[PDB]
Amino acid sequence: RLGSGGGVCGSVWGQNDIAYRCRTCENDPTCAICVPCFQNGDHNSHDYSIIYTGGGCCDCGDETAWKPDGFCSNHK
């Protein structure tokens, strides 16, 4: 998808991987971030969930997919 450039997390998911959904930081229901990005950010009382994904990429740092307050440390 289009999205922003700059300091976004490359990470890509293969067929038996884990990501995190966060209904609080997300722009739409298919946004997700990789495990390190979630744990290196602050989501304490957000409505997050674990997801076993078979594909996609981490939305961390891309403000067209993820609220910037939900970025982890290494992505602004």
Q: Which of 1, 44, 45, 73 lies at the binding interface for a second copy (CB under 8 A)? A: 1
Q: How far is the CB of 57 from a second copy (least distance, A)?
A: 7
Q: Which does 4 bind (CB under 5 to 8 A by kind): a second copy, Zn ion, none?
A: a second copy
Q: Rg of the Cα trace of the chain? A: 11
Site map 24..43 versus Zn ion, x via CB under 5 A: xx--------x--x-----x
Q: Which does 11 bind (CB under 5 to 8 A by kind): a second copy, Zn ion, none?
A: Zn ion
Q: How far is CA 3 from the centre of its chain?
A: 13
Q: Name residue 34's amino acid.
A: C
DSSP track, 53-76: ESSEE--TT-TTTB-GGG--GGG-
Query: Token pair for residue 71?
Result: 């970025």
Site membership for Zn ion, residue 13 (CB under 5 A): no
